[PDB]
Design a binder for this molecule. Structure first.
Ligand SMILES: C[C@@H]1CN(C(=O)[C@@](C)(O)C(F)(F)F)[C@@H](C)CN1C(=O)c1ccc(C#N)cc1
Ligand SMILES: C[C@@H]1CN(C(=O)[C@@](C)(O)C(F)(F)F)[C@@H](C)CN1C(=O)c1ccc(C#N)cc1
Lengths: 355, 355
């Protein structure tokens, strides 16, 4: 019965944002060195997000969803406390940990669908107004980024201690990951629509005209973003041309500049009105009766990147993923609990500044 | 010595956002009808913006710039009070007005450069930090939109009472306005660089495949936005290819959908890092030792549109202007003084929610 205490403790610490090069330095660059680090970091990260939840309307708190996941974190937090007084050296004290991590990871595997359920519960229970949308948007963005960062650490440890350093590829060939996400989307598009647009890729390596474009990144993260975009671009190109015979291709450009590595995906799927675009990244409005876009964007932001959309109604849409080109600039984007984060939930909107 | 009083009065009223079709209904759809309207509207709009200024740091208030323009509005407000007790019918009582408008318009002709001077005064006097940037951004956006809306009314009256209804073209051929802004930028580009990229235009009239794209809009407003973008796209295409012989063209696409009319301008001028883009629309950071972009965007927003940028470092930049396709949806976007607008100036930032 000391959960509130632990959370009060570790909640006082700020999480330590790691860079992608520090990740590259790490089989056996001492997991002892990691164990001791993860012993404090995970609890600090779990506690900060747990501390922020506890401070949202009891209307949201009392729902089975929020309390279900809120109880998952409480258990994961306790699940790792065990090792605070333990001593490494014991080749079994740190394997008790790797297992303790794999067990915590799977315990949270369905947090996204679970949390989406809460959004729906809220829409039908309290309505879908801007202030609700705003608070949910603010919180889910932080909650999910928090989750992404925790899973990153866990995957890095579990994978490294069972060319690639954990889930990191130091020579990630962006165009290859583009092709992979494409092939997968194509296969699904073919089954469901029995027709699919082709793919054209083009690279622009500013500094080195023909050297293939490589970067240090987490391929699975990039695959996720690209796959989500290919699906939308495919669904729209197919559906908007159901009476046309032509079927334009989806074009992708990978450009590498001094500090940015950009990927643009252009489709001619009809486009979307500016007003609806703004709603495409909102958890509340994109819920019924998925969260590919809002979450794909958190993956972009996690390492200081971004994901943006801009279409032309009546023509098509461009989706662009901005990633940092240098591993030096690829530092975790983490949400922290402060007096600053507190007042973002004090939105008392009623009659704006514009008419 | 009653300025504070008048401002306290009219400041209680909210400005009346007009649609572009109401503008189309109006030589002599009775300027009496307008005179009486503008008699209350202008004072209400002048007072609301004047009321918001009076409530910004005295550090900003005391500068010659802010007080210089603050005294211009005070005089324009009084300049129109005169007609509050007047009676139309008198064919000279309303010409005293048209002149009173032309005189007020010119009195404010240099408010932009004047206000930009204040920004610089502030940068050097108090520094250029995010909270300063934010408050200036918030206020200048509103101040300038307020100004744009006031000049719109004035121009509509003065022009209509000296095919087009004032400054409104009910059959504005977007592609023609594109060509015009281009020719002008080209001429300047040719003088200064003695080389300039060509232009390709393409239309996508979704509903009517080949009918030229026309819309009801204020051509001079659209010309302003396009000219500003062509200049930047030209400067960058030329400068980034000073050692290349090839010189790609600037491509523009005009797409007309059910509710949106979009114009995209794509250049291959090298592109800009994501981090600097965010700073391109900031009055503070774009000041030295112009305001084409931040202001061009207010012109887009004035009638519910927008202006966005997205480039690929090492390749080029896309700039897109979103306008409403229907005159029904083209309603003035006006800033209003409320308890809502008040708290946007209570930014006490110090240590954010992210680490
Ligand atoms: C041991 C820590 C964490 N780490 C790891 O690779 C992992 C696999 O253990 C994990 F992904 F799980 F984090 C490197 C960034 C090196 N590293 C550090 O450089 C470090 C960072 C901050 C502190 C502190 N305080 C101490 C060490
Ligand atoms: C007379 C007003 C203003 N107006 C004008 O065209 C102008 C030229 O006078 C100006 F641009 F300067 F505004 C139309 C939108 C018609 N109109 C209205 O439809 C109207 C709108 C609101 C109210 C009110 N309250 C009364 C009339």
């Amino acid at each position: 019965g000391s959960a509130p205490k632990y959370i009060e403790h570790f909640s006082k610490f700020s999480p330590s944002p790691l860079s992608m090069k520090q990740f590259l330095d790490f089989s056996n660059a001492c997991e002892k060195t990691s164990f001791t680090f993860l012993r404090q970091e995970l609890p600090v990260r779990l506690a900060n997000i747990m501390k922020e939840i506890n401070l949202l309307p009891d209307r949201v708190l009392s729902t089975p969803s929020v309390q279900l996941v809120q109880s998952w974190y409480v258990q994961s937090l306790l699940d790792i406390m065990e090792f605070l007084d333990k001593d490494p050296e014991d080749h079994r004290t740190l394997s008790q940990f790797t297992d303790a991590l794999v067990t915590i990871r799977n315990r949270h595997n369905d947090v996204v669908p679970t949390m989406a359920q809460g959004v729906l519960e809220y829409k039908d229970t309290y309505g879908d107004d801007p202030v609700s949308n705003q608070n949910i948007q603010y919180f889910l963005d932080r909650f999910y980024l928090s989750r992404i960062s925790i899973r990153m650490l866990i995957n890095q440890h579990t994978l490294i201690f069972d060319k690639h350093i954990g889930s990191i590829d130091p020579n990630c060939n962006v165009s290859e990951v583009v092709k992979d996400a494409y092939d997968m989307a194509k296969l699904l598009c073919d089954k469901y629509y029995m027709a699919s647009p082709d793919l054209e890729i083009q690279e622009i390596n500013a500094a080195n005209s023909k050297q293939p474009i490589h970067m240090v990144y987490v391929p699975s993260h990039l695959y996720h973003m690209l796959f989500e975009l290919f699906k939308n671009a495919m669904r729209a190109t197919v559906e908007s041309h159901e009476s046309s015979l032509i079927l334009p291709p989806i074009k992708v450009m990978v450009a590498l500049g001094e500090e940015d590595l950009s990927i643009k995906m252009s489709d001619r799927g009809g486009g979307v009105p500016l007003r609806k675009i703004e709603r495409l990244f909102s958890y509340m409005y994109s819920t019924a009766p998925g969260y590919g876009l809002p979450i794909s964007r958190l993956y972009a932001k996690y390492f200081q990147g971004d994901l943006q959309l801009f279409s032309m109604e009546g023509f098509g849409t461009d989706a662009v993923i901005y990633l940092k080109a240098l591993s030096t600039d690829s530092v975790e984007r983490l949400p922290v609990y402060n007096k600053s984060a507190w007042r973002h939930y004090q939105t008392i909107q009623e009659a704006g500044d514009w008419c």
